[PDB]
Amino acid sequence: YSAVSGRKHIVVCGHITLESVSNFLKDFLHKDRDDVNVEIVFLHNISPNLELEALFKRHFTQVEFYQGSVLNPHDLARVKIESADACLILANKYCADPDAEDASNIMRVISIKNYHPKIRIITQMLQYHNKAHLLNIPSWNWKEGDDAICLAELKLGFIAQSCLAQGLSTMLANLFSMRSFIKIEEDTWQKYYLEGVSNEMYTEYLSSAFVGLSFPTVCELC
């Protein structure tokens, strides 16, 4: 790859396959989001097959590929991590033996940390018991620029937090998929439901004029 001034590029590594790439890319480049200005770079050690070539070509201006590994500190020099911004890690959810998958992910994090300490990392995990080991590696900074997203924890968390009130699971889970508003005219429930499906959750700084007021009052004002 090459580095171009004025922009930013990220990296991915892990279980690269048609389903995962389609879902991730769909969520990443969806038009509803704020004006996006990034590029996407993949790595893998199996030459992608014909079917996936379709997706990697169709976004000829936003996706680039480089065969290699992630454990070889020459490959991780090709991709130019030393000027990147993050490195996500797709992890295989439907594995046979859970333990091997997260072990391999652990070692991947280890190597990427080995090449550079000041990097950002966002990954997946499969059981809370093994999540803790990642707390140990020397440069993870939970306080600054780092994080980790499990599945089992979030799964049971959604279910439990919905135990107190029906359906809360769906209401949460729909807030984190980018969707656009739709037209339905038949007087079914589908129209009234899609009415609220396409909502999302965003963040922004406030205005200086609202400092000296009351949270209920400012909520009502908003």
Partner 1 sequence: NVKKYDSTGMFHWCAPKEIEKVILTRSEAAMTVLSGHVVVCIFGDVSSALIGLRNLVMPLRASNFHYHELKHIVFVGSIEYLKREWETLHNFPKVSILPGTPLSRADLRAVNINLCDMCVILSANQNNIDDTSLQDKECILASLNIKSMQFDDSITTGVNIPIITELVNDTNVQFLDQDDDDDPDTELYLTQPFACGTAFAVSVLDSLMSATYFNDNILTLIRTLVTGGATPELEALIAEENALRGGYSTPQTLANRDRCRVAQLALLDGPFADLGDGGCYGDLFCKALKTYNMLCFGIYRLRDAHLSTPSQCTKRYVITNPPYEFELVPTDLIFCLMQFD
153 is in an annotated binding site: no
Q: Is 174 in the site for partner 1 (CB under 8 A)?
A: yes
Q: Is 171 in the site for partner 1 (CB under 8 A)?
A: yes
Shortest Å distance, C-beta 99 to partner 1 = 10
Q: Pick the piece of the chain touching partner 1 (CB under 8 A) from 30-38, 51-59, 84-92, 104-112.
A: 104-112
Q: Is 161 in the site for partner 1 (CB under 8 A)?
A: yes
62 is in an annotated binding site: yes
Q: Is 103 in the site for partner 1 (CB under 8 A)?
A: yes
Q: Is 77 in the site for partner 1 (CB under 8 A)?
A: no
Q: Which residues pair with 122 in a beta bridge?
A: 88
Q: Is 104 in the site for partner 1 (CB under 8 A)?
A: yes
CA distances from 153 to 121, 158, 160, 169, 177 (A): 19, 9, 10, 14, 19
CA distances from 29 to 64, 65, 83, 117, 212 (A): 14, 17, 22, 29, 39
Shortest Å distance, C-beta 110 to partner 1 = 6
Contact with partner 1 (CB under 8 A) among 22, 45, 62, 114: 114
64 is in an annotated binding site: yes
For the segment 179-208, give every residue that binds partner 1 (CB under 8 A). Answer: 187, 189, 192-193, 195-196, 199
**Structure-block tokens of residue 18:** 């048609």
Contact with partner 1 (CB under 8 A) among 38, 73, 147, 182: 73
What residues have CB less than 8 Å from 85, skipping those under 6 apart?
8, 9, 10, 120
Count of residues of this chain found to bind partner 1 when the rule CB under 8 A is applied: 44
Q: Is 46 in the site for partner 1 (CB under 8 A)?
A: no
User: What residues form the annotated binding site for Mg(2+)?
Assistant: 39, 62, 64
User: What residues form the annotated binding site?
Assistant: 39, 62, 64
| Interacting residues with partner 1 (CB under 8 A) | 71-74, 100, 103-104, 106-107, 110-111, 113-115, 117, 132-133, 135-139, 142-143, 161, 164-168, 170-171, 174-175, 187, 189, 192-193, 195-196, 199, 216, 219-220
